[PDB]
Amino acid sequence: XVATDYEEIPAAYAX
Amino acid sequence: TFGSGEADCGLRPLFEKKSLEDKTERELLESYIDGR
Amino acid sequence: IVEGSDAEIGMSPWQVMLFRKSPQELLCGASLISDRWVLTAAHCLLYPPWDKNFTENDLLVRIGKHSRTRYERNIEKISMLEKIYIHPRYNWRENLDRDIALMKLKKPVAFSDYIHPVCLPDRETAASLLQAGYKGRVTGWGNLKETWGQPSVLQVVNLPIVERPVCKDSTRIRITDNMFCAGYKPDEGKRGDACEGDSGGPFVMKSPFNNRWYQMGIVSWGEGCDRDGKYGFYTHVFRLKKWIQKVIDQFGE
Ligand SMILES: *[C@@H]1O[C@H](CO)[C@@H](O)[C@H](O)C1NC(C)=O
Structure with a gap:
């Protein structure tokens, strides 16, 4: 903690 | 697993294992009042 | 950084990416210390003040990465979590003392030129x-x-x-x-x-x-x-x- 677009993954990985 | 890691722990396949150094490791070494 | x-x-090669399932997002860093165990900060998973309380099923682990957003085909390995363990005395109420947690992977991961503990x-x-x-x-x-x-x-x-x-x-x-x-x-x-x-x-x-x-x-x-x-x-x-x-x-x- 500081006190002040991802390529899709393959359908399996989830579950 | 349990401390001191694994038999092979902490030795990188692309550097230690082939005797290559990464671009900044020496900075570290030199800081320990001069590495191995 | x-x-x-x-x-x-x-x-x-021990660098791990804690990844949010949905929304799909980068949650935090982590480290590989054996074929089946990952080490991270407790606060990555639990922080009641912000309403932060993740569970096994909520996350994914990505190992062997280099690129931040790409899915590195044939290079990266993705695993699912079997169980999470936070230190019993982790102190999120005041100073984050004892901010540490272990995660047990669902199946051991194999080592490679890009993955090593x-x-x-x-x-x-x-x-x-x-x-x-x-x-x-x-x-x-x-x-x-x-x-x-x-x-x-x-x-x-x-x-x-x-x-x-x-x-x-x-x-x-x-x-x-x-x-x-x-x-x-x-x-x-x-x-x-x-x-x-x-x-x-x-x-x-x-x-x-x-x-x-x-x-x-x-x-x-x-x-x-x-x-x-x-x-x-x-x-x-x-x-x-x-x-x-x-x-x-x-x-x-
Ligand atoms: C996180 O969420 C859990 C179950 O999935 C709890 O049982 C637990 O008490 C928790 N954190 C609390 C809110 O601090």
Whole structure:
């Protein structure tokens, strides 16, 4: 903690 | 697993294992009042 | 990482990416310490003040990465979590003392040129390397600036350990023995720090006696990023080694 677009993954990985 | 890691722990396949150094490791070494 | 550089390929093969299922997002850094165990900061998973409480099923682990947003086909390995363990005395109520957690993978991961575990320190290693002025190395995909942006590949920065008193004198938060601080002093004219996104990643050192890499710290907190007179704080792995040992010994390995 500081006190002040991802390529899709393959359908399996989830579950 | 349990401390001191694994038999092979902490030795990188692309550097230690082939005797290559990464671009900044020496900075570290030199800081320990001069590495191995 | 603020004021760091692009890592080289295979430079931190124990670097892990904690990844949010949905929305799909980068949650925090982490480290691979065996074929089935990952180490991170408790606060990456639990922080009631912000309503943060993740579960096994909520996350994914990505290992062997380099690129921040791409899915590295044939290079990266993705695993699912079997169980999460937070230290019983982790203190999120006040100072984040004991910010550490272990995650058991669903199935062991295989090692490769890009995936390899780091070692955990022994008392002697700790004693010999954890001294003010010695440098250690931080890695991660976190932000590049306090307000900026986000990097393309893994970033790296080398930082020196700081004398406890200076650490204490830089903040109002109360410091414990389970923590240490690191960064350059204002005079020093050399910068660098961890930032948002870096949390839970590894602070490592290389042993000059046996050539191995040891993880001495976990990125824990800071007040802003890279400010002058300020320092990053890290969980002191060795002082928590027993809890690690215990958990691994009792729930497999
Ligand atoms: C996180 O969420 C859990 C179950 O999935 C709990 O049982 C637990 O008490 C928790 N954290 C609390 C809110 O601090």
